[PDB]
Symmetry: C3
Subunit: 278 residues, 3 copies
Amino acid sequence: ITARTAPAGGEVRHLKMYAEKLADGQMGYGFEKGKASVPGPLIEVNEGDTLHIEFTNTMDVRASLHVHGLDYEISSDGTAMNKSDVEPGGTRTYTWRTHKPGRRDDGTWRPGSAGYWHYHDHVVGTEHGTGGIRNGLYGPVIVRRKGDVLPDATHTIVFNDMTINNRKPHTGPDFEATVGDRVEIVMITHGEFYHTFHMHGHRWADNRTGILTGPDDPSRVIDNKITGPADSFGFQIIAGEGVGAGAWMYHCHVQFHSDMGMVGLFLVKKPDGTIPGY
Amino acid sequence: ITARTAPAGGEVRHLKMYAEKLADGQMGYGFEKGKASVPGPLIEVNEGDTLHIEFTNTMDVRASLHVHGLDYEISSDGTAMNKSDVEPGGTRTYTWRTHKPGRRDDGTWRPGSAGYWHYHDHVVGTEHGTGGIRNGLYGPVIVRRKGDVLPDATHTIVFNDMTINNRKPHTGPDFEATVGDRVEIVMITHGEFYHTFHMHGHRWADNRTGILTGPDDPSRVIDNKITGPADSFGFQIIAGEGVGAGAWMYHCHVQFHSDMGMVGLFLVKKPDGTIPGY
Amino acid sequence: TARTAPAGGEVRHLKMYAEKLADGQMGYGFEKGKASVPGPLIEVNEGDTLHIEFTNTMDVRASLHVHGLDYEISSDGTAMNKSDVEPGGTRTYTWRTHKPGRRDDGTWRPGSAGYWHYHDHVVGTEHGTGGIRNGLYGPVIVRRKGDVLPDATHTIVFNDMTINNRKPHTGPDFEATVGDRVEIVMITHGEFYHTFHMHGHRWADNRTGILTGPDDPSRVIDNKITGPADSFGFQIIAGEGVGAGAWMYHCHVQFHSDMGMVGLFLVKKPDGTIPGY
Ligand SMILES: [Cu+2]
Ligand SMILES: [Cu+2]
Ligand SMILES: [Cu+2]
Ligand SMILES: [Cu+2]
Ligand SMILES: [Cu+2]
Ligand SMILES: [Cu+2]
Ligand SMILES: [Cu+2]
Ligand SMILES: [Cu+2]
Ligand SMILES: [Cu+2]
Ligand SMILES: [Cu+2]
Ligand SMILES: [Cu+2]
Ligand SMILES: [Cu+2]
Ligand SMILES: [O-]
Ligand SMILES: [O-]
Ligand SMILES: [O-]
């Protein structure tokens, strides 16, 4: 493999995050005050890293930070129950850890932390974050295994109830690549509804990475995946591979949902920047 | 293996398809005028084949042909957006390609096209084919990999909203086999609802082919599979294997749906044609 | 050096009953007056045969239908096939299981092993809608030779808007000690899709919930979408890499967790304490 690959992890990383009310009523996380986003910033680490997040709640309501998949002690689970959320104006330091796979003492195999995960609030609106999640307090987390192929770019598509990334119906988001780019998608679902994520012209493996290790990988190859609240998966595709440049739709394939606006464009451009038929 | 297996592909195939309005209000694809069906005809090809489909819309409304999984250029995605649908009475030649898996230049592994896929309209009723799909404009596509086991017969079961293959509730379809037949199922979902596909007395591997390569295949073995709009999977079973002849129900396991008629019979006969207790 | 399942092949016998419960529910049991919701766990090894002398103590027809395992049409528990059981009746269902192996044609036959379940098929409707709603469901585990055996198994069933037919916001809760090998059988029933989530723990989305080793492509997850009659299972090391604590599990459909589909996986330190509880 002469594509770029993830290094062995084991760093201790530090990071500041904030939760802000947005002018429009939404709420979002951010690495800097005044720079919050929905989805929140992507956090990306290598198996074995430790991540210390100094999180500061700048809102008038209790808020928290709960993560999927990664190792964390009960003091960092972000629930009111475990006294793990954050009062208005407060600051708390969450710790997320990750480990590599390996043999246990009993001889069994411990799974690694690697995968496409996500983080979200657990105390805004209800003790389960129904309010925070609806408002935009969610973001992606990627834990890489040594040797994983690194992409050219990562995009995050969150089906949040009847919206993509809390956007107005029929307003995307759209993404751009050039034929040949290694594009990574992180795909998260939140809220009340099941969906099916479909991409025109591209396909991926329904496994941890979206990629087949080689000819022995029995994983199904798909272009349509059902998902429900808090499901997270990801994959890599070579933009336009075997199909060429184009305005390639992605969307929920629940007919009413796509009719109502859960559609976006994967805009794959020729080297001259053009998109056939757009 | 002394079962029949798929050959290496790489032929250029040519096909004529039509969309027709049916007397009863439904819409269907067909290989000949007046011989349309719901589901539409099964297209089956080998990885590496190219398929040129001269498609003619015999209806009074615009209609199109959109396919999952297979390779196609933006001019064949069958969307209005890309000027890819077909005006009433028009004729257009869609091209679908397929490829085998293999090493890329960067050392990574390109997935092959092989799988259980499907095609459907994209412009009847809405820019997403909600009307076409609901009227019956969907059909199965099978792309086989060199060495895949070939079945004795293939049946197609489509959960379209509250119906199987657009049939009236409680009217099947029923299928028939003789104990020992290698029966292939293509299972496709369409519309607004999630379902769970269950088959009594039989089970399959939840992977690309429904079959375990051998003792190292970690794939879950199941008899119940959740599916959402535009999901497609398939599998093979040995009719009556380890269970004998019988009228074996298949159905959606969502209690209300099976109660409302999403039920059918896998009628597995003894060599004398009889079904115990039917 | 963990305990592993033996090769199967025993012929097992078992009595089961269906009872109406005082509160209106219905449940299976191995003994009259000892029925549960979920019903008792049945566990066997690939190759075992299981003869269940089922007696219906209810005033309505009831039956016993199982997923995954081998059974003849006479044991499929449907009214259609004349294999349900009249009130007060007794019928002997036979479930069989086989190991994997090469067929005559050279193909590979899948084994019966997995996380399965049984439920009624004739109470309320010809599909058990009433039986299932009332509590007539339980788990079945078929083990493959060599499978890791757990310290304890718990069964979590998402039945419509309930866990194990319990009032919203009443668990069930489960207890382990940091380090225990805890097995979960997770079954869904009724009308709704759910997503099962556990705080602080994860598993492999394959047959066993465990990775055989480095070459297992299976996704590791902590959220699984699930629909009526879906069954999966897994083992976790309680508190592994996360420590003791009151770890929530719940449906992650926001409204469902708000409405009460929540429970606690109470992982204790060796002194019995739970930080923050
Ligand atoms: Cu939670
Ligand atoms: Cu949707
Ligand atoms: Cu498509
Ligand atoms: Cu969550
Ligand atoms: Cu589309
Ligand atoms: Cu259904
Ligand atoms: Cu069944
Ligand atoms: Cu489609
Ligand atoms: Cu059934
Ligand atoms: Cu739920
Ligand atoms: Cu969580
Ligand atoms: Cu069932
Ligand atoms: O589509
Ligand atoms: O069933
Ligand atoms: O959560």
